[PDB]
Design a protein around this ligand. Structure first.
Ligand SMILES: CCN(CC)c1cccc(O)c1
Length: 284
């Protein structure tokens, strides 16, 4: 029975290494990672890998690892797949902790845009959870934390994190992570997976997939929302992606909306994440 070495980047940036049989389905590796992380609420999380295009793909837990990574290294990242709309309803604090770690990376990476004050408030709750009560002995008029908080760090932002941290005296880690999530969950791009596309007229847009539905970002003025209830069917063909959109109240026919993706693989990637999110929605 031949075994392949797996390397997994965890959300704290640490690296987990293990072996699985070469014919293993993704679930086998994911179970080993989740046991390492003492994670029980596993269904919100998944593993990603990079293809030769350095594009992120979800490892399908139901499919053979070898049939997915194909030519690539057995190198993966542990990520949030389904962002809970209401993280207070997760059963375990450790689930909320890994969700906070994922959101901290979504923020630093710029996937999750954030106002100055929200960057400072989230940062202040992270510092509270990890260091406890503000300590002046660990501070100065110049102080620059180790913590990454934003895609573009400024002294103004560092100062504001310290001001807010002083206010959290006595707050426990689970409490500070809950306040972190109460703020993060309200951000317009929370849990939104963005896909580059063109509309039917060749105009570049972004397609956003999230718990609530599919978002179109044409411009800051033109923004379509298709709540999952309105979506009957999601399909791809060649480089094309289509959604079948419910007749309006008293209308006779469904409508189909068509999009151009960068290639067949990018169309397939978007369709799979849409199907998986639509299922998640009907379980809420
Ligand atoms: C079990 C997999 N399924 C996929 C959408 C899922 C994922 C997260 C929560 C949940 O209640 C269900």
């Amino acid at each position: 029975p031949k075994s392949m070495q797996c390397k997994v980047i965890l959300l704290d940036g640490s690296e987990y290494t293990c072996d699985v049989e070469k014919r293993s389905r993704g679930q086998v590796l994911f179970d080993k990672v989740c046991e390492h992380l003492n994670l029980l609420e596993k269904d919100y999380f998944g593993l990603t890998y990079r293809d030769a295009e350095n594009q992120k793909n979800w490892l399908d837990p139901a499919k053979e690892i070898k049939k997915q990574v194909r030519s690539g290294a057995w190198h993966f990242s542990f990520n949030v797949k389904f962002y809970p709309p209401d993280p207070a309803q997760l059963s375990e604090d450790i689930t909320r902790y890994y969700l906070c770690l994922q959101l901290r990376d979504d923020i630093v990476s710029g996937r999750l845009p954030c106002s100055f004050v929200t960057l400072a408030l989230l940062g202040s709750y992270t510092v509270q959870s990890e260091l406890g009560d503000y300590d002046p002995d660990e501070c100065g008029s110049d102080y620059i934390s180790e913590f990454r908080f934003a895609p573009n760090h400024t002294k103004e932002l560092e100062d504001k994190v310290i001001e807010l941290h002083k206010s959290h005296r006595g707050m426990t880690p689970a409490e500070a992570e809950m306040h972190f999530l109460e703020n993060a969950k309200k951000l317009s791009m929370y849990g939104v997976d963005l896909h580059h596309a063109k509309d039917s007229e060749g105009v570049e847009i972004m397609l956003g997939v999230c718990a609530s539905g599919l978002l179109i970002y044409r411009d800051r003025l033109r923004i379509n929302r298709f709540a999952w209830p309105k979506v009957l069917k999601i399909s791809y063909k060649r480089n094309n992606f289509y959604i079948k959109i419910r007749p309006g109240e008293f209308e006779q026919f469904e409508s189909t909306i068509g999009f151009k993706l960068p290639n067949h693989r990018a169309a397939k990637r978007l369709w799979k994440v849409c199907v998986e999110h639509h299922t998640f929605f009907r379980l809420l």
